[PDB]
Amino acid sequence: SKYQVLTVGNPNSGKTTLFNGLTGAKQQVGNWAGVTVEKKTGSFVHAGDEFSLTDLPGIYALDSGNDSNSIDESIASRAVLTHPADVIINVVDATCLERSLYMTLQLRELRRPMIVVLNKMDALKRERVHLDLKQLEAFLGCPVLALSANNKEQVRRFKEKLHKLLVQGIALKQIELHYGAEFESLIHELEPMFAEQAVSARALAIRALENDRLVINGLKEAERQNVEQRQHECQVDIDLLVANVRYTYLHELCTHVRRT
């Protein structure tokens, strides 16, 4: 079998280190379709199956229609929405969970098969910090694996676990992110227009309320006007509201996960 894998994470997460450890010399560099940004792909074979890897440029969040130039965030937002992938590997710097897991939450809302890879666990153990990984799986609702991407042996072990999870299929558990009665009803008003898409209608409705360019652009003018009218029905700033809700959840998460 041939498996398609996307790797996504913040800059400095060790995403490139894991990618290189998995593919070695079997890598190519090109361009993303329609732009000049570098496209890095690689492959490896394991236990008779082929693994096809596409690396996404490092980003801190998905596209939210922010004038902040960020061609990379558009590319990663597009890929995370429309690029084929049997699994999205979200590489997270475990020494920096509260910030790194912000995009993790956005990815989880898409409901695409994904796993969270906590990288730099050696740095954590140097800080004498323990992460309750079962609690972390409970809060994220997706497989969570911990390693150091500079350790060849742990990377080799990661291949076996990744291969097993792809053969099993990835079991996702609903993520209890509630944005408050008012915004939830706005998501509810908008969800039917994103039914019958390749991604969660709830996710697309949220991203459209966040003004994700990749979502808004595909809409017809009347659908755009329904989205922009919903946006002004929000009594508060949508960007602040979703950030608050996401970071409030991540504060509860770290409490029950992180111990020194």
Residues that bind ligand GCP (CB under 6 A): 9, 11-17, 58, 119-120, 122-123, 148-150
Which two tokens mark 67? 């004038």
Q: Is 36 annotated as a binding residue?
A: yes
237 annotated ligand-binding residue: yes
Asked whether residue 65 is marked as a ligand-binding residue, the answer is: no
Is 248 a known ligand-binding residue? Answer: no
Reduced to 3 states, what is the DSSP secondary structure of residue 47? coil
Comparison of 60 and 247: residue with beta carbon closer to ligand GCP: 60
**DSSP conformation class of 36:** -
The nearest distance, CB 57 to ligand GCP, in angstroms, is: 8
Show the 3-state SS of 87-156.
Answer: EEEEEEEHHHHHHHHHHHHHHHHHCCCEEEEEECHHHHHHHCCEECHHHHHHHHCCCEEECCCCCHHHHH
The burial of 229, by beta-carbon neighbours within 10 Å (0-12 exposed, 13-18 middle, 19 or more buried), is given as exposed
Helix or strand or coil: residue 31? strand
Nearer to ligand GCP, 20 or 231 (CB): 20
Quote the least distance from Cβ 125 to ligand GCP, whole Å: 10
| In the complex, least distance from residue 170 CB atom to ligand GCP, rounded to whole angstroms | 22
13 annotated to bind ligand: yes
Measured from the CB atom, the residue of 85 and 92 that comes closer to ligand GCP is 92
Binding residues: 9-17, 20-21, 23-24, 34-38, 55-58, 119-122, 149-150, 237, 239
